[PDB]
Amino acid sequence: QKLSKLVEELTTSGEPRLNPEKMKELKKICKSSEEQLSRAYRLLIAQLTQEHAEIRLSAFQIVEELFVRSHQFRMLVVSNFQEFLELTLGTDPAQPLPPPREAAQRLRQATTRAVEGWNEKFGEAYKKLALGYHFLRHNKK
């Protein structure tokens, strides 16, 4: 719906840059209804699973901004988020063989910095962020 419209308007790689007005509109829409974000993750898995690395970066940034801002993606990324733990363990680490890793190295660095930020941003009881960061630092950063 409108979630998909905003996802298309933002993830488009023809203008691959962070736009604040669209992101604040998405934040306000997600705050208006929690069900906006539960399908948004499904949209983001579309963008993470897409061929273009810029779309993956855009969907990662959208997920991060919804988790840190909307207060509805927080209840997806810091509660009922084993999907998020597995996507963190599969994104930076090697994709499970035979399927190899398809993201770009700049996207790997961006994910590393996002994990380092989220270690302190929301870690009141979610320590698997830090555990995954340590595993990366000792196995496939």
Next chain:
Amino acid sequence: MLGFLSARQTGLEDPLRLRRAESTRRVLGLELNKDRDVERIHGGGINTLDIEPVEGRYMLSGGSDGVIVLYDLENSSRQSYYTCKAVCSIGRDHPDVHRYSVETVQWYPHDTGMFTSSSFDKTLKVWDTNTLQTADVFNFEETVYSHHMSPVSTKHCLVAVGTRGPKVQLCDLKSGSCSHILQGHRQEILAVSWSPRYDYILATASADSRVKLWDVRRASGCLITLDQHNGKKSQAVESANTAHNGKVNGLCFTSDGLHLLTVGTDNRMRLWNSSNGENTLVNYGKVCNNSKKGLKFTVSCGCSSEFVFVPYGSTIAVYTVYSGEQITMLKGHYKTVDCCVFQSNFQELYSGSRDCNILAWVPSL
């Protein structure tokens, strides 16, 4: 439930019902407690955990880095949230620390004053818990994949040790005699386990896909070799009577000791009658293991129904022992899961993993 309380109170049901039924209900509700943590001390993956059989207060933990950590599982703080603090630790600086990965660690049953730990440095060291100094060191000529002391033997104090050699070594802690060997396997022995029922029965599983139960008192070789088919494919035993179609890297007698659960790298678990090794044909489906070393798994105790908790990759799969129904898969680790141990007092599960974490799974509400 209030029906359960009222039934207990009026004697309609034996109080055993409410324990066992409630114990089960608690097991089915196991969920990663973020209201409980275990202090991170391992630099490497946890290969093994062991809660002490008497009083269940302390846990030992063996790491891939060689350190043995000793944790206290009681919430001595007044908060509802606590971290199981690490009491002691055989750290990198201990003179006696293992040199390579600790592969097994075990409390001496009958007393918390001594535990034992075996490693890839080819040693099984016996430790005084109090002074935390080794009391004995047995050296083996090949890397130790697992050992096990009898949970029941008031009489003997043998440790069965499985190494990469094809022979099972029995180490007598009473005057230290590491000569006795059981011979009959053909490749590394990836798992040994004493029977919880019979004082001198030992089951040993090997990479040759065969599992043998031994009466170590006996001078005459294995009692039983477990056979997948029970005889449908029957051959003069030189290569047949394999328990699995891969390596058998796990054993666990069920609580009462009447059945044996083996897991092997054909991605199957089987349930065997430990008296005649017959196969009960419990299905259990597909259980992923591809561990190259022993896989340490447990059963539940004191519930209405017995459960087995098996590492399934990065999760712990819970199955009902006697019917095979997969209860659930507890998903909270990040890398493969190496060991899970069950706390029988409170139906809590602790599981270690290669990601250097020990996660507690406690029943919800």
